[PDB]
Structure 1
């Protein structure tokens, strides 16, 4: 659980502190945010909080499973949205930061 501890103590915490992660800290509320077909279009929803619980509850067996989840969160946003959307710009900054943290992993 060494790389997993990195993902939890370093990667996640660092991403969490940035305000551009705020829309990603909870599953998408399709009603409150008026995204009526969100769950019709996205089949594998993912958010940071789900990722955090999975780390807390020892859900992951290997670090690749966690990294898949992050990847799914970003691509989900790209799929659902289009270039130029605010949320996409936010997703892009999170992802960049993510990849930078990952390159430092043991």
Structure 2
């Protein structure tokens, strides 16, 4: 509705910024370079990859029609991490910390 622009700017200026500032954001900032990381199965398992810079550019470029498409992308980024890796892997514990912060930020999103 009329608050969609309000919610998308919150996702860009608060949610994305605060996740990026988090010490654990580094491995999620750019697409996984599966050649450099020697992960030849990564993009066979992860058919719908997502990363913070892709979300950042989609927000800047007004790619989203509503904030829910953006939330879906964040959700996919976290879910993909838990899918490819094992419970308890370092990257999974990093993602879980970021997801916890993400859900706090969502709980404070304006209802204007």
Task: Say yes or no: TM over 0.5.
Answer: yes
Match of 2:90 in 1: 86
1:45-67 residue CA offsets vs partner (Å, 9 max, x unmatched):
00000000000000001010000
1:76 alignment partner, SS class = helix
Q: How many residues align?
A: 106
> In the TM superposition, what is the alpha-carbon distance from 1:19 to its structure 2 partner?
2.0
> In the TM superposition, what is the alpha-carbon distance from 1:33 to its structure 2 partner?
1.2
Give TM-score scaled by structure 1 length: 0.98
Match of 1:98 in 2: 102
The 2-side partners of 1:74 and 1:34 are apart by 21
> In the TM superposition, what is the alpha-carbon distance from 1:35 to its structure 2 partner?
1.3
Which structure has the greater CA radius of gyration?
A: 2
1:38-92 residue CA offsets vs partner (Å, 9 max, x unmatched):
0011000000000000000000010100000000000000000011100000000
Instruction: List alignment gaps of at least 5 residues for structure 2.
Output: none
Match of 2:48 in 1: 44
1:8 alignment partner, SS class = helix
Segments of 4+ moved more than 3 angstroms: none
